[PDB]
Amino acid sequence: SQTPDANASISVSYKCGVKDGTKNTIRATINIKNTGTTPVNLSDIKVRYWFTSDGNEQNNFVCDYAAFGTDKVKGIVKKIENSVPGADTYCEISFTEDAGRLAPGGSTGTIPFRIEGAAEYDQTDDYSYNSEMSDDFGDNTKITAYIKDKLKYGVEAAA
Ligand SMILES: [Ca+2]
Ligand SMILES: [Cl-]
Closest ligand by atom to 41 CA: 2
Its domain, for residue 158, covers 1-159
d(CA 102, CA 13) in angstroms, rounded, equals 15
Cα(98) to centroid of ligand 2, in Å? 7
Q: How was this structure determined?
A: X-ray
Going from the Cα of 90 to the center of ligand 1, the distance in angstroms, rounded, reads 11
Euclidean distance between CA atoms 45 and 42, whole angstroms: 5
Q: How many degrees, rounded to 5, is the angle at CA 47 between CA 144 and CA 99?
A: 150
CATH of the domain at 37: 2.60.40.710
Residue 104 Cα, ligand 1 centroid: separation in angstroms? 36
Binding positions for Ca(2+) are: 52, 54, 122, 125-126
d(Cα 72, Cα 113) in Å, to the nearest integer? 13
Distances from the Cα of 8 to the Cαs of 1, 3, 45, 139, in angstroms?
A: 13, 9, 11, 19
Asked if residue 111 lies in contact with residue 66, where contact means CB atoms within 8 angstroms, the answer is yes
Helical H segments across 86-147, by residue range: none
- Angstrom resolution of this structure: 1.9
Backbone phi, psi, residue 10, to 5°: -130, 160
DSSP 8-state class, residue 79 = E
Distance CA 91, CA 79 (A): 9
Number of domains in the chain: 1
**Please, which residues have CB less than 5 A from ligand 2, an ion?**
96-97
